[PDB]
Amino acid sequence: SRAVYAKLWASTAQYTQRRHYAWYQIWSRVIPWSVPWGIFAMWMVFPAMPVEYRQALTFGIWQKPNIGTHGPDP
């Protein structure tokens, strides 16, 4: 019957939408890898920033290492 053949033909009309859905799925699986690599980027580039920005970005936890040299002069 024409009706059934029409339904079967039309079953795949929306190919592009299904492909967009596929884009969404694979990117959802992939994108969390940005966190490891982001941490490492920041790890490497932290000692390049100004001392003030190092102190700020760590909420004051980070401070200049104390190795027993270059102390104040009376």
Partner: peptide, 28 residues
């Protein structure tokens, strides 16, 4: 004795109404 077959006559119909009797089918 052969069975007494019932007749089924041909009739022509509007496809857009026959399409309301088609089962639902999905591939995507």
């Amino acid at each position: 004795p052969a069975p007494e077959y019932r007749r089924v006559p041909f009739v022509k119909e509007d496809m857009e109404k026959v399409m309301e009797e088609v089962p639902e089918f999905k591939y995507y």
